[PDB]
Design an enzyme around this catalytic site. Structure first.
Site, PDB file in Angstrom:
ATOM      1  N   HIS A  51      -0.106  -9.348   9.137  1.00 45.25           N
ATOM      2  CA  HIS A  51       0.133  -8.979   7.601  1.00 45.25           C
ATOM      3  C   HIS A  51      -1.023  -9.695   6.713  1.00 45.25           C
ATOM      4  CE1 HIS A  51       3.507  -6.612   8.133  1.00 45.25           C
ATOM      5  NE2 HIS A  51       4.298  -7.750   8.465  1.00 45.25           N
TER       6      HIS A  51
HETATM    7  O1  LIG Z   1       8.363  -8.880  10.784  1.00 44.82           O
HETATM    8  C1  LIG Z   1       7.787  -9.269   9.962  1.00 44.82           C
HETATM    9  N1  LIG Z   1       6.562 -10.009  10.218  1.00 44.82           N
HETATM   10  O2  LIG Z   1       6.207  -9.921  11.400  1.00 44.82           O
HETATM   11  C2  LIG Z   1       8.095  -9.203   8.468  1.00 44.82           C
HETATM   12  C3  LIG Z   1       7.461  -9.765   7.540  1.00 44.82           C
HETATM   13  C4  LIG Z   1       8.068  -9.455   6.339  1.00 44.82           C
HETATM   14  C5  LIG Z   1       9.169  -8.784   6.399  1.00 44.82           C
HETATM   15  C6  LIG Z   1      10.165  -8.240   5.443  1.00 44.82           C
HETATM   16  O3  LIG Z   1      10.436  -7.146   5.311  1.00 44.82           O
HETATM   17  N2  LIG Z   1      10.504  -8.802   4.246  1.00 44.82           N
HETATM   18  C7  LIG Z   1      11.239  -8.162   3.238  1.00 44.82           C
HETATM   19  C8  LIG Z   1      12.796  -8.673   3.229  1.00 44.82           C
HETATM   20  N3  LIG Z   1      12.630 -10.232   3.090  1.00 44.82           N
HETATM   21  C9  LIG Z   1      13.277 -11.125   2.654  1.00 44.82           C
HETATM   22  C10 LIG Z   1      14.830 -10.837   2.086  1.00 44.82           C
HETATM   23  C11 LIG Z   1      15.182 -11.295   1.182  1.00 44.82           C
HETATM   24  C12 LIG Z   1      16.570 -10.801   0.657  1.00 44.82           C
HETATM   25  C13 LIG Z   1      17.186  -9.905   1.425  1.00 44.82           C
HETATM   26  C14 LIG Z   1      16.822  -9.284   2.256  1.00 44.82           C
HETATM   27  C15 LIG Z   1      15.502  -9.892   2.576  1.00 44.82           C
HETATM   28  C16 LIG Z   1      13.026 -12.309   2.506  1.00 44.82           C
HETATM   29  N4  LIG Z   1      11.662 -12.350   3.098  1.00 44.82           N
HETATM   30  C17 LIG Z   1      11.233 -10.707   3.418  1.00 44.82           C
HETATM   31  C18 LIG Z   1      10.159 -10.191   3.928  1.00 44.82           C
HETATM   32  S1  LIG Z   1       9.530  -8.408   7.996  1.00 44.82           S
HETATM   33 ZN   LIG Z   2       7.739  -7.189  11.878  1.00 48.84          ZN
END
Ligand SMILES: O=C(NO)c1ccc(C(=O)N2CCn3c(-c4ccccc4)cnc3C2)s1
Ligand SMILES: [Zn+2]
Ligand SMILES: [K+]
Ligand SMILES: [K+]
Length: 354
Positions: A108
């Site tokens: 990312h």
């Molecule tokens: O698997 C991953 N990287 O390897 C991810 C990186 C970022 C991810 C992602 O989808 N995010 C959106 C949801 N999220 C949250 C949330 C914050 C409140 C409710 C649900 C999710 C915090 N940080 C993230 C990053 S998955």
């Molecule tokens: Zn991921």
């Protein structure tokens, strides 16, 4: 010994993910049969192959609070070094293949932007050095994390020497990170050499083994084989596996399947493959898949797939996602120009017709 290497380091630690993974690998005995190598910090110069100096200087330097992230940045730097170190040892012959049990994820982080828990694109900096310091002519990057590898796409969006491919949940730009439309095909000299295998259609049903297994059969492997690379770097994320809920996950691949996927990717480039951990947060799931991937790397006889999955035809949302991607990349690849579509068939069927 010319065998499957690993990379671990406990200075990357905040039991956690990579700690559990490493444990599984010990208890299963795979760790014994592998050659555990020594890691190191990435050099400022190494990180700057992919990222800006401003970004490197901010997050690369050694100066439940703010200091949490600072260590995670310090870990990420070491992560890149481990991934650099394994890749070179496999690429130069010293080792057959690898698996980097490293954290945080990387695919990312963009040129000068830290996002998605990612500070430095490990697999990318690795690929960049392969070009520069070993004049490698063709590098394949398969990124089977559930999410789009936005960092990795950007890094090589103009370089036709690095074939980037990404199997991800896309849902017409309604998922994290939002990028990765199949339409995106590269630019300049590197048009055709960026393939987004982008799943659209939500969780009706969730994409599973047969769906991904089809995707390999019809897109990943055909293009990769034609392209025919010298080194395979897999952004090996396990958030596609079963037991990651809707939002921070979604799909239901068995771990077993990722072994099969490793096994297939081993067909290319003399078996010069290295996997590197990205996503996947359910501790059973990521331990399972790690067990399966490394087992396959050692060339151990694999646990056969359930008759069911081998016989199951892929869901419509998939078949439709495949045909769109195939259609697009039939412009730039011969193995897509010849044929009519067969992405609706099960594995057993596809093989019944060879
Ligand atoms: O698997 C991953 N990287 O390897 C991810 C990186 C970022 C991810 C992602 O989808 N995010 C959106 C949801 N999220 C949250 C949330 C914050 C409140 C409710 C649900 C999710 C915090 N940080 C993230 C990053 S998955
Ligand atoms: Zn991921
Ligand atoms: K490219
Ligand atoms: K991906």
């Amino acid at each position: 010994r010319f065998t499957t290497g690993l990379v671990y380091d406990t200075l990357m630690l905040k039991a956690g993910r990579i700690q559990s993974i490493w444990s599984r690998l010990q208890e299963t005995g795979l760790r014994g049969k592998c050659e555990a190598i020594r890691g190191r910090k990435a050099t400022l110069e190494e990180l700057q192959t992919v990222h800006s100096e401003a970004h490197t200087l901010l997050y690369g330097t050694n100066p439940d609070t703010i200091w949490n992230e600072v260590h995670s940045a310090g870990a990420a730097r070491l992560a890149v070094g481990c991934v650099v170190e394994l890749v070179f040892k496999v690429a130069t012959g010293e080792l057959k293949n690898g698996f980097a049990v490293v954290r945080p994820p990387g695919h990312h982080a963009e040129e000068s932007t830290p996002m998605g828990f990612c500070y430095f694109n490990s697999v990318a900096v690795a690929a960049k050095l392969l070009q520069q310091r070993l004049s490698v002519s063709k590098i394949l990057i398969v990124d089977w994390d559930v999410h789009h590898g936005n960092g990795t796409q950007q890094a090589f969006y103009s370089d036709p020497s690095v074939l980037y491919m990404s199997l991800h949940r896309y849902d017409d730009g309604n998922f994290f990170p939002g990028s990765g439309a199949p339409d995106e095909v590269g630019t300049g000299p590197g048009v055709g050499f960026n393939v987004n295998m982008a799943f659209t259609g939500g969780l009706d049903p969730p994409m599973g083994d047969a769906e991904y297994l089809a995707a390999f059969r019809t897109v990943v492997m055909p293009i990769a084989s034609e392209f025919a690379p010298d080194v395979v770097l897999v952004s090996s994320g396990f958030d596609a596996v079963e037991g990651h809920p809707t939002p921070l996950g979604g799909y239901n691949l068995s771990a077993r399947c990722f072994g099969y996927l490793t096994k297939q990717l081993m067909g290319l480039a003399g078996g010069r493959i290295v996997l590197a951990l990205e996503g996947g947060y359910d501790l059973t799931a990521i331990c399972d898949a790690s067990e399966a991937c490394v087992s396959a790397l050692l060339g151990n006889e694999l646990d056969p797939l359930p008759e069911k999955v081998l016989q199951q035809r892929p869901n419509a949302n998939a078949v439709r996602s495949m045909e769109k991607v195939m259609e697009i990349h039939s412009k730039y690849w011969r193995c897509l120009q010849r044929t009519t579509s067969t992405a609706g068939r099960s594995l057993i069927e596809a093989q019944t017709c060879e």
